[model samples]
Target: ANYRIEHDTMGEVRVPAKALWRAQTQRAVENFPISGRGLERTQIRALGLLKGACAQVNSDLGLLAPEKADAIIAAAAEIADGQHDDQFPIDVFQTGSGTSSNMNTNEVIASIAAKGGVTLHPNDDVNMSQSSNDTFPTATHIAATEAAVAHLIPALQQLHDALAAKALDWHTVVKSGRTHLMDAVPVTLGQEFSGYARQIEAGIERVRACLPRLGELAIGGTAVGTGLNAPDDFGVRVVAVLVAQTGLSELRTAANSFEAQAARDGLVEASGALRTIAVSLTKIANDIRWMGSGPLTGLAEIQLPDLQPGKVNPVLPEAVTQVAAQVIGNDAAIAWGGANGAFELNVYIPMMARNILESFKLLTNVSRLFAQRCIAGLTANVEHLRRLAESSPSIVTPLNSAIGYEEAAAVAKQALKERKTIRQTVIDRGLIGDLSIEDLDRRLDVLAMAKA
Candidate 1:
């Protein structure tokens, strides 16, 4: 391949002629061949936004020449807007502190800045007021936080509304309820679906509650927590600019930069909340799949719209289940990364950021698709629900209060054995005992069984 020489602190290295990243990025490219994947688009944009903020702040405070700052800012904005995505080529698994990716952004932005006729060194100018230590973690928070606030939470709200609407639509549908894998009492379809809606509504709050912790940025704590070479107001000013640039109002600088840079408790907590949502979705999806089971053999209390020729699988719910599994696995990775922190910094930050962002993206997409494809199209199998409710022996429970307990048990047992309904069994058993037909109908009303 044709090449050009780019210099870093460590001498010179050959890179492709058109590539924006240079020698330090080259070293990372050579060193880590582990994961071929690079940083997610959201994180890359976040890194660019942070770099742009740094350059603007540094220029405002007279840390860099105005011409150089202008070029760097233009280039950084381009990167932030996702113009130079392919320029950042380092593997996501490289450098535990994400220094490699940080440097990749610096080099790419500096090169583009140089093309505009200003001399700008990647580190001295583009990364002047920041260090990979602070910038990487800061960018991680920015990406993860924005994704939740802008995407995931809205998706969940849509899902909640869909479930609530379905609950209302199905409110009058009486059906048999199951307990311990056996027939229990009766419940309205509305009552069952309302529980699902409540789960999603609560899940939205769980994801939202992690924002304040995640919004605490670590930008000013350059190199170490001491803020050594950075201007005293650099952290505070950069964050203010970042808030306006990103539109994430929750963002702020951390009071203790040391703790902020050292611990990833915020990401871990966010991942836990994401995991909780995954669990909620899993339960809702499984219940839906079961309720919509075999059009002939299984519950078949509800039917799914057919997409293919044969029996319709619960395609969206199955997809949600797979996403739930991935979210659960990603949470485990984030947990491991959070726990493996050493002295002044956590070494597992890249994996933590990657997993958390992926989890957020996954949940966002799954929630939207699940709502549109599955929840919106569902209908109660009214006749089947009624049949199951009327046939269930457990509907005799309220009758225990009318007749003696022993007589009610005998009647229920006879109903099960004779394959008759409780109404029929009561008539055949000669156990009227002053209970008229209208009384029987009132005592064993399936439609009114579930109070909620």
Candidate 2:
């Protein structure tokens, strides 16, 4: 490949002739080739947005010349718009502090500015009032918060609405409920779907609760938590620009710069909430998978859409379960990353950023997929459901009041063994003391039991 020489403080290094990044990014590209995966698009966009905000703030504070600031802002906007994604070649695992990626953004913006007939230094102009230590975490917060608000929450809302609509549609469809995987009592299919919908609704609230803390940026706390070379109001000014750029009204500076720079508790809490949502999705998917298990052998209470000739599979539910499992695993990595913060900085930020963004994307896409492919097209097996509801041994529960517990237990056992219903068993044994068989039918009405 054709190469050009780029020089940093250390020495001159060879870079791609057409590449936008300089020595630091090229060094990182050569050094860490462990993971082929680069930073997520959201992370990259966050970095670009942050860089532009910082440039705008620096210009407003009279720290940078107006022409230089304008050029940098224009370049950073290009990055944010994903117009130059090919320029960022550093791996996500390159630096724990994400310094490599930060420098990559700086070099790319500086190069772009240079192309516009503006002379700019990567550190002096593009990274004016920021340090990689502070900027990386700030970018992480922006990326995570934006992704959750723009994608995950909406996907969850879609899933919740789908489940709720199905519940309302099947409100009168009675089915057998199970406990410990055994038949227990009658319940409307709607009730089961309602529970799933409520789980997603609660998950949305849990994720939203993390937004305030997640919006708190650590930008002004420059190298350490001391706000060394940065201006006093740098964080606030940058956040104002971010608010304008992203249109996220909750954007704000951290209450405690030291705490924000030293710890990642907000991210941990957000990951914990995502983990819980993953678990809930797992439960819903597993239940749905079982409910649509087979055509002849299993419960088969619902029929999933079949694309093939003879086989019908709950493909979307199974896919959702797999996605839930991955989100859970990502949460574990994020929890560990959040805990590994040393004094004044969290070194595991890149990993945490990668995992959290991944979880957000996975959950968002899978929730939408499950809603559209499975939940939206589900069909209830009405005859099978009715049969299961009627044959459930727990239907003898109301007989306890009339015939006593011991006698009701005897009736349930005989009914199951002799392949008869509770009413049939009672009539055969002449157990109806005073009421007619018509009244006995009312006493054992499965639909009434389900409603009650």
Candidate 3:
């Protein structure tokens, strides 16, 4: 490949002739070829945004010339818009503090500014008043916060809305409720779907609760938590710039730069919330899988769309379960990474950022898919549902009020033994003294019991 020489503090290195990145980035690229995975797009965007904010703040502080700041701002904006995504080729695993990726962004922005006829130094100007220690954590927070608000929350709301609509539509469709894979009392399909909807609603709130902490940026804490080289007001001013640029008004400076730079508790908390959502989604999807099990032999309470001849499968629900599993796994990685905060820095930030972003993306996509492909199109097998509801031995529940618990249990056992309906068993046993068959039927109505 054709190459050009790029120089940094470490001396000269050969870089791709057309590449935007400089020596440090090229060294990182050649050094860690482990994962073959670069930083996530959201992470890159956050880096771009942070660089731009820093540049604007430096200019506001009269530390940088207006022409230099203007060029850097335009270049950073281009990066934020993903115009130079190809330029960031450094592996995510290159540095624990994400210093390599930060420098990669800096070099790219400086290169872009140079192309626009402005002489800029990657570290001296573009990265002025910032260190990877601070910028990296700040970028992680911004990426996660933006992704949750923009993607995960909306997708979850879509799933909840879809489940809620299905509940309303199937409100009258009665079916047997199961506990521990055994028959229980009758419940309307609406009630089951309502439960799923409520889980998502609660998940949404859990995710939202993590945002305020995630919005706190560690920008001003350069090198360590001392804020050396960076002005005392740098973090506050940078946050203000980010708030205006991203329209995320919750963005703010970290109350304690040391704690913010040292630990990633907020990311861990967010991952936990996401893990809970994944668990909830798994339950809902598994239930749907059970309900749509078989057309001839299985529960067959509902029919999912079929992709094969004479075989209907709950493909979307299966996919949703897979996504939930992956998200759960990602949560484990994030938790482990978050625990590795040593001294003044969490060295596992890049890993944590990757896992959390992947979780958010997976949940967002699968929630939408499950909503559109599975929940929206599911059709209740009304006849099968009614059969199951009427056949359930636990339909004898309402009889306890009239016949006493012992008698109700005896009646239920006998009905199961004789393969008879509860009404037949009650009538044959004369369980209700002098009451007509009409009254007995009313007391044994599965639909009425389901509604109640």
Candidate 4:
């Protein structure tokens, strides 16, 4: 009963009716709607693909010369930026396999470029050689990677720098290290903090690794991913135009367009990378939440800048610890995650992407605050840290000088449970030599920092 707004540059073409009912209905059934957030950002990002696609088709065939392409591309950029936000009037969550979504973008572009604000021509300026099947996915890809390089990486880099600064700045603050959620060995609060920096740096690198592949655009790979109806050189032209506009080197198409459009491996891969980064972020968050546990009962070692949430003790029982609740529940769910945001299946490729993007934003920003407030110069209970630190086989082996692996393991376990230094416990039990503990702390710090 519905129809799309029509227009003509060369002929009458019906853009098609934007049927959003089915998608809306589907949204109600999915348990994944934990978020009431609309699909607007998702849609706008999808639309950018359409606009960019038209720019490619028009520019290559001289639908408009350089000056015109430049003008159109410029406006499209504006639309790309603003339409993506709350500025435009459209449903964020809609159905159409992006068909209706493409029309929404097409209408907006045409409306902006049209004369007297009444000049209706959706088909003319909005779409030329592209279809929703082609343009929608293309836009989604560009929007994702575009935001990733421009937003995600830089944000995470800030986090890495902050953590590194904390480690460097607080290099002297000695504290306890933990394992199995129990105290292990004496490590500098600074040393413990530095782990975050390395994690973030590695995370940033992992994310960047996907960019080159993510940037291999699907724009020219028209409907069904074949560029079937598009001009022979359309893919080349579109990529070139985007590269020139964005100044990014990764603007290219797949060698095989068929697989490119039909299968979303690139997008899935990109999402997976983001999820991988999220795991690192979750680690950082979990650590912060753990360290910031108390002004009183918990570690109270490193103070998180955020409000210390209410907590509950086992014997007396204070308020339920929300953080521990998450650690035992929510975080556990994501522990092995992937699409489900777990590092496991990595389900909901789109949502994993959403969660990851959100986490990067929070994780890095929080890292800075954590650094300034407590991550720097923060020390855990040294006795507790050492007791905990020895829990790890890697850390404990070093405690025993020239000892067999089994003895070292035994020493580490005793130290962990009994909250004793591996050297003291081992020597009391009479295993290793008179190893110096003074340099031991510093030595381990270097090993952990250097990723040994």
Task: Assess candidate 4 and give its TM-score to the true structure.
Answer: 0.64
The all-Cα superposition gives candidate 4 an RMSD in Å to the true structure of 9.4
- Cα lDDT tens digits, model 4, 1-452, are 45554333333443324422222223232423444564446446546644765675687697655554554565567666664354333333333345554665665555454422333345555576676556665665666666667666776677677778877766755555566966454566676667878987887887788777676666665556656767877777777766676666765777667655555556556656655555665666666666757657666655333333344222111111222232233222223333222211122323333433343344334444544544443444444443444434446645455566777678767776776655467666765335445545543452363342
**Which sections of candidate 4 miss by over 4 Å?**
1-53, 64-74, 83-93, 115-120, 306-452
Q: Give the CA lDDT, 0 to 100, for residue 358 in model 2.
A: 95
In order of appearance, the predictions have TM-scores of 0.95, 0.94, 0.94, 0.64
lDDT of 1 by residue, 188-224 (tens): 9898889999999999988878888988999899887
Candidate 2: C-alpha lDDT: 0.88
Q: What is the C-alpha lDDT of each candidate?
A: 0.88, 0.88, 0.88, 0.54
Query: Tens digits of per-residue lDDT for model 2 on 1-452?
Result: 59999887787899989899999998898899988889888888999999999999999989999999999889989999988888988988967788999999989998999888999988888889898899999999998899889899999999999999999999989988899988888999998999999999999999999999988899999998789999998998899889987899867899899889888988888999999999999999999989888777877888887634234878888888888889888999998988888888889988898899999999999999889888988899887787767766788778777778898888888888887767788988887667677777887888888884
Candidate 1 local lDDT, residue 183: 86
Worst 10 residues of 3 by lDDT: 305-314
